[PDB]
Each structure stands twice: as C-alpha cells, then as structure tokens.
Amino acid sequence: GFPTELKPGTNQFLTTDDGTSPPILPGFEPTPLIHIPGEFTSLLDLCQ
Amino acid sequence: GFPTELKPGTNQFLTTDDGTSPPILPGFEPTPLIHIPGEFTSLLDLCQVETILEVNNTTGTTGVSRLLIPVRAQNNVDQLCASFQVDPGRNGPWQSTMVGQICRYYTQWSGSLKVTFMFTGSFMATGKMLIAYTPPGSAQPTTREAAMLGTHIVWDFGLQSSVTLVIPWISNTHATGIVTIWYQTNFVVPPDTPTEANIIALGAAQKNFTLKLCKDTDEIQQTAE
Amino acid sequence: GFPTELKPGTNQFLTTDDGTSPPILPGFEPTPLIHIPGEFTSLLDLCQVETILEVNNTTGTTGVSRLLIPVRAQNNVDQLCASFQVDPGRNGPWQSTMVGQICRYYTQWSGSLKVTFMFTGSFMATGKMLIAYTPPGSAQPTTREAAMLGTHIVWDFGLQSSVTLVIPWISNTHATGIVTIWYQTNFVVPPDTPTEANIIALGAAQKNFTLKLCKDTDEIQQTAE
Amino acid sequence: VAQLTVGNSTITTQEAANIVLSYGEWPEYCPSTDATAVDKPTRPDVSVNRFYTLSTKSWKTESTGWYWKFPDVLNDTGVFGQNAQFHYLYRSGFCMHVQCNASKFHQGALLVAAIPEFVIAASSPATKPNSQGLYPDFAHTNPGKDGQEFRDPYVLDAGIPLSQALIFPHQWINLRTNNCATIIMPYINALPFDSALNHSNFGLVVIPISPLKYCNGATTEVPITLTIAPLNSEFSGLRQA
Amino acid sequence: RCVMNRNGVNEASVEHFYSRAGLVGVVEVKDSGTSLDGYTVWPIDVMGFVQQRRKLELSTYMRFDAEFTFVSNLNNSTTPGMLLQYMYVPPGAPKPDSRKSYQWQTATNPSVFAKLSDPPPQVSVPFMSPATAYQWFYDGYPTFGEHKQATNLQYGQCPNNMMGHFAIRTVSESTTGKNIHVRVYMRIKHVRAWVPRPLRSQAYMVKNYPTYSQTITNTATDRASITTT
Amino acid sequence: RCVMNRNGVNEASVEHFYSRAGLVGVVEVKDSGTSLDGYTVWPIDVMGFVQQRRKLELSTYMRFDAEFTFVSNLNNSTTPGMLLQYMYVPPGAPKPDSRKSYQWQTATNPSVFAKLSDPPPQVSVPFMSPATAYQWFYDGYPTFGEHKQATNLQYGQCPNNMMGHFAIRTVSESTTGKNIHVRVYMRIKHVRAWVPRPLRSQAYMVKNYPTYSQTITNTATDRASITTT
C-alpha cells in the first residue's frame, strides 16, 4: 500500500494532544443547543 | 515512506464504527435489485400506524377479549367505563401496539399520539360516552364532571361509530397522561338488540413523534432456543 | 508524522484481495507482446461453441460410440429414439460439452441453450424424427403425440441433415427441461444402403447465457501425481 | 349501489369504492425481464381475471376467524386454477372483496387484513425434538378455497400479536357502519415470478375482533362472502400433463 | 421530566435500526481434550439470537451487505501469535470436514489469514441471495411436489437465505492443545426492508420455525381492573 | 427454483477466471531431526496441483504477471520472530545448495527479508518468458537434432515456461531445530489467454506430460438406457 514510516511518538498518549477520536454513538443527535443567558467564554471576564 | 503516527484507538474494534472492509468476493455481482412493494425506511412510519390497544388487559381476560373495551347497559350513569395511561413504552395496554413495541427498542421518545375509538355495537344502539384526557401530573378524574371540566370528547356513538383523540405530548424519557371513558348517557337500545357492546381502542403516533438512542428491547428473552 | 489508525483487517491476507505488490525485478522489461491469433477473453465465448453431446452415455457403450444417437429401421413407429435432460452442469450427456464443463467451474448459471442434431445416414436415407423439448417441471412425454402437443420440431432428415433446437431457459442454481427424439416415420431407404444411422447431438449456450460465482470443479481429483 | 361486470361474472356492490390499496401500489404487469424476453409470459384476459366468489363462511358468536392463502385459494378453481396448475412460473395481484350480510340488529367487528408471507405457525404443547407437532400440516398451511379457521386468532396462528396485524394492508368491517372490505394486493415477492403451487404470496385473514352478537330471533350466523379478482396475472412455462 | 423538543428523525431510520455490528455467533475452535478438531465451521446465521431474530422479523424482505468481524482469543483471553485461517465458504460450496481437508485450499473460497495477535479480521460479505432480497418469512415449500409429509418440515424454510459458512482453523500441522474462542460480529450495511410485520410476541420455541407454545402469553401485562392505573 | 434474470458477464471473463490467488506450493524449511538443511528451493510451478493445471490447460498460451504471497509458520502454527530470507532465483541463475551458500548473497537475486511474525511477504513476479506467452502445450522438442531416443522424454517440454525458483532459508548461523512450513500463494494478474482447448478429461498421471492411463474414463457418467432420465 501507500508507503509510510512510523516516527517517534507513535502509540504515545499525551493527555494534552487535541486528537480525533471516533464517536461511540454515531448518528446520535445530542439535545439541540438553545440559548441560555449568562454564557462566559473567558476567565478574564470573571477576573474583571 | 510517508511519515505517519499511530494514535490511541488503533487496533480497537468498536462494533459501531462505520468502517470499510474489503469484500471477500470482489467482482461478485449480487442479484439486481427489482422493485418490491411495501418498502419502509423509517420506524416512525410504523409508529404512525394505528394498532389495537389492549385496554382490557385485566386478570382472567384471555385472547382477543383483551382488545375490547366492554360497554353495557349501566344501572348507574356517569360511571367510568375504562381508563388507561398514555404511555407507549411502558407495560400496559400500549404493549399491544406497534408504537408501544417500537418504543421498547429506544430509550427516549416524544411527540403527540392519537387514540381512535371504534364502537362495535348494533346500528340501533345509541348513547354518549365521554372520552376525557388528563394531562401528565394530574390524577385521573374521579367523576364524569371532573373529566368534563378538562380536555374531553362527548362521543355520541349513535351518530359516529369512530372518534379520534389526539394526545398532545407524552415525552417518556429513560408522570404520564391518562385517558378515561365515562358513560355520559345510558346504553340505549330498541327491543331485540344486544344491550352490551365493545369499544376497540387503537393507538398510534403522530408525525411529530420521534425516537432516540436505540436500545435492545426486553420484550424477548434468550433461552435454550 | 501523518496521523493514522490501523483498522480491523490489517496484516490479514485475503487471497482474493487485488492488492499491489512491489515487483521483485524493477526495470525488467518483459518480452514485448506480439499478436497471437485466437485470443479468448471470456469463457462465455467458449460456452457458445457447439460441442458433441455424449447422449449415448449408456452402460457398455465405449469410446466414440457414446457420442452417437443410433437411429435404425424400427419395427414400430412413434418409438422414443433417445432422450436427455437439458442440464449442462450436471452429470450426464452434457459433461462431454464445453458449456457443460465450464458450468462445473461455476455455481449458478442461466440462459438459453441451443442443441444441434446432425443426421449422418446415407444421402438416400429419408424419414422424419420429432425433436420435442419438454419444459422444466414436466415429466418427459410418454408418447410421440404427447410430445407433438408441446414444443417440438418435425425433422425430415431426408431434406435437411441438420436441425437446431433452441432451449429457451435452463437456470440451474447451486427441475430441468428434457429433449426427446421420436421416430415420426420409419427409417426409409432404397436397396443397397444401410438401414441404421446415427444422430450427432451438439450442445452449446446462447449469447444470453451467463455464469456466476467461480467454484473449483469436481471433474478432477488430486492424487499422487 | 352498482353492478361490477368483469368477464362473465357480475357482483352487486355499493359505489364510492372505498378500497384499500396495499402499500399504495397498483398491481402491474412485470416489465419484460431476460427470462421473459424469450417466452413472453401469458397475460390472460377477463376469462381468467374475473370475479371468483368462494363459499361463504358463517360468522358465528364463537368463530375465531378464517384465512386464505391466496395463490393457493384459487389453485383448484376454474381457468385460473388451470393456469396455476399447468404453468411453471406465476405472478399476479388480487382484488379481494369481503362482504358481510348482517341486519342492523347484528353487531360485531371484523379485521380484514392481507398478510404477505403469512407463515402459519404450529402450537406445540412442549418443545419436542423435530416432531410432527412442530410444523403445521399442509391442511393448515394451504387451506385451499375453503379457508381455515384460526386456532389462536390472538396470535394470528403465527406468534405475532393480532393487535398489530393492522400494520398489514387491512380494513375494518364494523357491522354498524359497513359490511364490505376491499383490499387490492399487488404481487409482492422477492422474485418476479414464482410457483403458484408451492409459494403463497400472502394470506387474507378475516378475524372477529368484536364477537358477533344478536338477540334471540335474528339469524344466528352472519354470512361472510369472499370475492376474489386476480389483477394483472401472468404465467410462464406451460405444461401439458 | 418532559422533553418539549423533538428528537432526530434519523435514529428511527431502518438503516440506523439495523446498524451497530452485534454478536451473531460464538464458535470455538476446539483443539484439545476429547475434541482435537483444530477447526470449526460456522453457518452464517443472522438469527442466532432471539433479539436479532425479533429485530429482523420486523420486516418480511431485507437486502443488505454484511461486514463480519472475528474477535478471536484463547480461554484465558490471551492472544498469542497463532495463525488462523478464516475461510468463507460461499453458498453451494463444500465445507471442510477435517483440519487438513482439501477444501481449505480451494481458491474460490475467500480465505483470511490472520494471527490472534492481529486486530480482529474484518471482511464484507455482499448480498448473496438468488432472490432480490432475503426472506425471513416464506409461506411456501422449497420442494416440488405434493407436501403431505407426516412431519411437515421444510415448510416456511426459504432456501435463498443461505449466506454461506465461515470455516475457521489453525494453520497448525497437528493438534495445538489450545481451544480458540471466535466471536463473530456482523454489521448490516445498506439495509433495505420491505413489508413491515408485527414484532414477535410469543417466545421463540425453535429456530427456523415460528412455532410457539400452547400457553399463549398476553401481549400486555395484566391490570387489576379496566379502570385502575 | 428458476432465475429469470441474467447474471454478470464479468464473472466469466478470463481475467476473473484466473484471479483469486491460490496455493501453488507447500514447502518446508526443514532444520531439525535428520534434515538440518535450514533452507529449501521451490521451483516456481503454476501446475503443482491438478485443479490449477486443468484450469490453465484450458488455454494454449497464457501471459501474466504473478503476485506471490508466502504464508509461513511453524508446525504448531506459531509465528515467532524468526527472520526468513525469501530469495527469488530468476531463470538462468544458480540456486543455493546449502544454508550458507554464496548464492544467498547474489544481489541480482531479488531477496525478501521478513520475519515469521510479520504479515505474509508479497512480491510481484513479471512475465518471465523469452517467448511472448507461456505455453502449456508445446508440440515439439526443445533440443536440436533427431529425436529417436528410446525413452522419448523432452517431448512437449517447453523451456520458455521457466519462471525461476524461490529459495527460502532462515538467516540463522546454525541449525535452529525448528521446521518452517511455507505456503506459497500465487495470483495471476493481467492474464491474457490464446487458443482455448478442451478441458482435460482423463486423470493426470504424471507432471509435465499429458500421459493418461490405458483405462479410458468416459467423459459422461453412464445411464441405464439412452431413453432414461
């Protein structure tokens, strides 16, 4: 097949890597997101 | 070669992953697909089919008699003829329905249900029944008047032998509404005609009914088959 | 490197996967392909070639005599000369055909077959045979008349020495039609000419004939070769 | 009320034709396949596609119901029976008209449903190893033109609940509002043609949900008449026998 | 308590209702003790378990391709480097009868060689029926002739549902003394269903037949009265 | 019973008729007991088994590239990390005669190093004939001169069909005491065939020769009479 070569760092689990995992429940539609007042997106807004 | 890096989750078998497997028989042409009538592509289309409610699911009632709501000449009026909760997924009269059995294959469901009542007395029989629906969170009415004060249908089966009651919403996740049938009037008959009849209740879902989170049903049990 | 994830089916050898392997001899230029007459690209083209049916596959008949349908001066007319089922893939007269042997290499096949009959008597010999084909699901005719009432060919081998009978469909998956030959007339000959002759039956497939699901044949057996 | 005349058969039925079309599909002739491109299957006219009125069943107070396997219900009946007995392949739709003759003083309700591949089940007292009690006899799987009375109508004699039989093309006969049920069933099979004698494409059940009731003096049995009309019937591979 | 919103319409589709590869057979390649077989032949049965049988019998006709996955291991769950041969024996082909039978070499039998240490081997079996769809209900007789046999078996048994066998063996020369448990997982793909049916209410008594016990079980649980809730 | 539809025309193509890599040789690298060879040389033979021989002899001339796959393991089917060398010895090159022969180092012999633990090594051998196609039937003598030899061997033996050898060995220094079974699977690719022939009817007696027994076997099974069915 397509020639590849495993580099150092394969099979490692980083615990901070923003990897992509397969969903255990494909096709599962989560509860649609309705508007909730008071959303905060930055802790700096709380520090202020 | 092309530099890759195996991530966590390699070599795992998920049993729900929509992976791509190689065909064991490449070049094998399956039997060409011809048109067959009656293809169904959604279980909701089956939930929307009226099926008989086993309202008379009482002890001692056997066979087809469980599908009939007995209506007879009452010595007292305003009596409760029959009652049943509007809960397709739970044990009870709705187990005998297609919607009630399909809800068993799912975890959550919500939507409006319809309940059709067929009077099967003689053409000469006449009278009125009060089909009352009590919303969830309220106990079933104790008197015909309390039922009349809520959502209800005064069903004159002398005029129309069939009536439909639309339940606005159920939403049984992983209380419930109650439908009650009251003798609004006595069972009126001329001479030489049976004074007892039956009502056939048929339950189904509306088009806003939806299911969620497929779950293996408990209606069947694996044994030494 | 490039993030990958090994899925189920890695490291497996399928024996039917049309994979890509590296050539052991890169740069090796094979002998250039020159034109050779007689290239065949489909086994159906071989199935459509008429080959002799071993209709006389009877006990005691040996060698080439098995390929001949003996026709002689009969003491009784309307007698059955010979019969054989139209089943290329099964044991019997069709084993000696190319179509019958190729069907052994497959699991399912369907299509129309043709069966040619060659009369090999003297030029002075004359008479009529009734080539009747009985569709699948019907027993072979017991009398020449019952055969005449179905699909048949009154073959006057005094006029034409060859006749073709097209079998409309066979479709042997993993009953069958029957071809019967009846003495319509006696075997008529002038003096000093042989009163016995032979019919050579040749079977083949038509262009609508198709095969399916390659399967190792059972006509050969591996032993201490 | 009108008089439908098909061929030499005439039935008395009411107008407005409140007919149930099974799966919204009309019975149609199969488009010429490769197997049919060579033999051109026989499409008989109103000679075969006529009205066949079977013997009337007597609906009584204790009747459990009846069913007819339909390629089989006409296998020994007239020219349709002839074409079915003497052809290898068969394909047809059906118009089924179930009629009751009840007074306004009779009461009861029938569920008339057409069940494709109505596989009849045997009801065994206990699981015995591959015994006769595990399979229905031919008299039950192919009851012929006389139909078969249900043994356990609650489970349709097939282990499936009767209450859900309405998932099939069905029609109610509630004696107080109507006494006729008309179901039109197209040819439904995993094959374009099939054996009329071996395979029964569907069964038509007529089951009393509400039992028949009447007071003393009325006719103690309501006649149930079944009229069958093959629609777009085709046949192939004619035999002689 | 109440969900005033509507769920998704896709989770109720037939394709999704039959998704999610599930266990369809648990075969054991016995090669120790009193059974030195070293192989086993599993006839592909979509209805081995009553749950999947009831789900499939919701429809009369079904057409689908199937993805099979073989989760194999020893009794102690270990997966050593034992080489296994998962041979798919298509319908109409003869199955093996021994560890070293000639049928294991038949090239027309698609075979998968994989070690226990490898990820579970996975293959796609196409729609294998001579008909245009599988039949979970066949109101008829596959034979030809009159069917007055005393024990009326062969009734209702559709021959077109045969999907083949999965013959599994170690590639050993003699007995290995280790039993291998193979869990066959099958995923229904591109499923199309016709003629919905009532879901089976009576307990299944035997396989291949809709036979039910003489003691009918009510579809609905009992109440005290028709007026109690 | 009957299939009124037509199947696919592609399943009957010559390319598909010769597809599906099949077992063409089972060699054993003996390195224990009385045979401490540690190597084996397998002459590439497309006609090792009478099934494939009969399938190939359907045609007179065939031209194809071949994909070889080596399924190797021990007698107990285990695949330890033993390093094997699959050396392809092209036609005209000398083969090894010992475990540590100098021919194992010949760079012009394409060699594949793979451990038993690895997936089966797989290589593509191109069309290796001096002619434009292989000949399964060669009505002639490869020698030059008059051919009145008493035992008339060399008749019908085409020299252009030589595809080479596959010399397989462990990369050990001495005997390992373990026998390795190598199953050679060969896939015919880009096959083109010429001059179709009757399929062999008589049992094969020997390899490389069409010799048949004196007891001729009828092509068709016998009947009672010419009128019975």
Coordinates of N, CA, C and O in Angstrom, one line a residue, chain E residues 156-202:
Chain E
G156 N -42.0 -23.3 5.1 CA -41.5 -22.0 5.5 C -40.0 -21.8 5.5 O -39.6 -20.7 6.0
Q157 N -39.3 -22.7 5.0 CA -37.8 -22.6 5.1 C -37.3 -22.2 3.7 O -37.3 -22.9 2.7
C158 N -37.0 -20.9 3.6 CA -36.6 -20.3 2.3 C -35.2 -20.7 2.0 O -34.3 -20.5 2.9
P159 N -34.9 -21.3 0.9 CA -33.5 -21.7 0.6 C -32.6 -20.5 0.1 O -31.4 -20.7 0.2
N160 N -33.2 -19.4 -0.2 CA -32.5 -18.3 -0.8 C -31.8 -17.5 0.3 O -31.0 -16.6 0.0
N161 N -32.0 -17.8 1.6 CA -31.4 -17.0 2.7 C -30.0 -17.5 3.0 O -29.3 -16.9 3.9
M162 N -29.5 -18.6 2.4 CA -28.2 -19.1 2.6 C -27.1 -18.1 2.3 O -27.0 -17.7 1.1
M163 N -26.3 -17.7 3.3 CA -25.2 -16.7 3.1 C -23.9 -17.4 3.0 O -22.9 -16.7 2.7
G164 N -23.8 -18.7 3.4 CA -22.5 -19.4 3.4 C -22.1 -19.8 4.8 O -22.9 -19.7 5.7
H165 N -20.9 -20.3 4.9 CA -20.3 -20.7 6.1 C -18.9 -19.9 6.3 O -18.3 -19.4 5.4
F166 N -18.5 -19.9 7.6 CA -17.2 -19.4 7.9 C -16.4 -20.5 8.6 O -16.6 -20.8 9.8
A167 N -15.6 -21.2 7.8 CA -14.8 -22.3 8.4 C -13.5 -21.7 8.9 O -12.8 -21.0 8.2
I168 N -13.3 -21.9 10.2 CA -12.1 -21.3 10.9 C -11.2 -22.5 11.4 O -11.7 -23.5 11.9
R169 N -9.9 -22.3 11.2 CA -9.0 -23.3 11.7 C -7.7 -22.7 12.0 O -7.4 -21.6 11.6
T170 N -6.9 -23.4 12.9 CA -5.5 -23.0 13.0 C -4.7 -23.6 11.8 O -5.2 -24.5 11.2
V171 N -3.6 -23.0 11.5 CA -2.8 -23.4 10.4 C -1.8 -24.4 10.9 O -0.7 -24.5 10.3
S172 N -2.1 -25.0 12.0 CA -1.1 -26.0 12.5 C -1.1 -27.3 11.7 O -1.9 -27.5 10.9
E173 N 0.0 -28.0 12.0 CA 0.1 -29.3 11.3 C -0.5 -30.4 12.2 O -1.0 -31.4 11.6
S174 N -0.5 -30.3 13.5 CA -1.1 -31.3 14.4 C -1.9 -30.5 15.4 O -2.1 -29.3 15.3
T175 N -2.4 -31.2 16.4 CA -3.2 -30.5 17.4 C -2.3 -29.6 18.2 O -1.2 -29.9 18.6
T176 N -2.9 -28.4 18.5 CA -2.1 -27.4 19.3 C -2.4 -27.5 20.8 O -1.7 -26.9 21.6
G177 N -3.5 -28.2 21.2 CA -3.8 -28.3 22.6 C -4.4 -27.1 23.2 O -4.6 -26.9 24.4
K178 N -4.8 -26.1 22.3 CA -5.4 -24.8 22.8 C -6.7 -24.6 22.1 O -6.8 -24.7 20.8
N179 N -7.8 -24.4 22.8 CA -9.1 -24.0 22.3 C -9.1 -22.5 22.0 O -8.7 -21.7 22.8
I180 N -9.6 -22.1 20.9 CA -9.8 -20.8 20.4 C -11.2 -20.4 20.4 O -12.0 -21.1 19.7
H181 N -11.6 -19.3 21.0 CA -13.0 -18.8 21.0 C -13.1 -17.7 20.0 O -12.4 -16.7 20.2
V182 N -13.9 -17.8 19.0 CA -14.1 -16.8 18.0 C -15.5 -16.2 18.1 O -16.5 -17.0 18.1
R183 N -15.6 -14.9 18.3 CA -16.8 -14.2 18.4 C -17.0 -13.5 17.1 O -16.3 -12.6 16.7
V184 N -18.1 -13.9 16.4 CA -18.4 -13.4 15.0 C -19.3 -12.2 15.2 O -20.4 -12.4 15.7
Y185 N -18.9 -11.0 14.8 CA -19.7 -9.8 14.8 C -20.1 -9.5 13.4 O -19.2 -9.4 12.5
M186 N -21.3 -9.2 13.2 CA -21.8 -8.9 11.9 C -22.5 -7.6 11.9 O -23.4 -7.3 12.7
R187 N -22.2 -6.7 10.9 CA -22.8 -5.4 10.7 C -23.7 -5.4 9.5 O -23.2 -5.8 8.4
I188 N -24.9 -5.0 9.6 CA -25.8 -4.9 8.5 C -25.6 -3.5 7.8 O -25.6 -2.5 8.4
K189 N -25.2 -3.6 6.5 CA -25.0 -2.4 5.7 C -25.9 -2.3 4.6 O -26.3 -3.3 4.0
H190 N -26.3 -1.0 4.2 CA -27.1 -0.7 3.1 C -28.4 -1.5 3.1 O -28.9 -2.0 2.1
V191 N -28.9 -1.7 4.4 CA -30.1 -2.5 4.6 C -31.3 -1.8 3.9 O -31.5 -0.6 4.1
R192 N -32.1 -2.5 3.2 CA -33.4 -2.1 2.7 C -34.4 -3.1 3.1 O -34.2 -4.3 3.0
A193 N -35.6 -2.7 3.7 CA -36.6 -3.6 4.2 C -37.9 -3.4 3.6 O -38.2 -2.3 3.1
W194 N -38.7 -4.4 3.5 CA -40.0 -4.4 2.8 C -41.0 -5.1 3.7 O -40.7 -6.0 4.4
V195 N -42.3 -4.6 3.6 CA -43.4 -5.3 4.2 C -43.2 -5.4 5.7 O -42.9 -6.5 6.2
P196 N -43.3 -4.3 6.5 CA -43.2 -4.5 7.9 C -44.2 -5.4 8.5 O -45.3 -5.5 8.0
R197 N -43.9 -6.0 9.6 CA -44.7 -7.1 10.2 C -44.8 -6.8 11.7 O -44.0 -6.0 12.3
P198 N -45.8 -7.4 12.4 CA -45.8 -7.2 13.9 C -44.6 -7.9 14.5 O -44.1 -8.9 14.0
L199 N -44.1 -7.2 15.5 CA -43.0 -7.8 16.2 C -43.4 -9.0 17.0 O -44.5 -9.0 17.6
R200 N -42.6 -10.1 16.9 CA -42.9 -11.3 17.6 C -43.3 -11.1 19.0 O -42.5 -10.5 19.8
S201 N -44.4 -11.6 19.4 CA -44.9 -11.5 20.8 C -44.7 -12.8 21.6 O -44.4 -12.7 22.8
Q202 N -44.9 -14.0 21.0 CA -44.7 -15.2 21.7 C -43.2 -15.6 21.7 O -42.5 -15.4 20.7

